[PDB]
Design a binder for this molecule. Structure first.
Ligand code: ZN
Ligand code: ZN
Length: 52
């Protein structure tokens, strides 16, 4: 099994990982970011990710 926590796309800090919501929230109070864990952009909820 093992643990999982993803780096924040702004500051690379270990963000609070939410695999049940495909969401990640930064632990750095000056950064305070909310991202999609599939494409590492600002969180887009129920929408699908984008190519690049
Ligand atoms: Zn951050
Ligand atoms: Zn995405």
């Amino acid at each position: 099994t093992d643990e999982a926590l993803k780096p924040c796309p702004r500051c690379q800090s270990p963000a609070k990982y939410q695999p049940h919501k495909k969401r990640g929230l930064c632990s750095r109070l000056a950064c305070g970011f909310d991202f999609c864990v599939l494409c590492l952009c600002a969180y887009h909820g129920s929408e699908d990710c984008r190519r690049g």
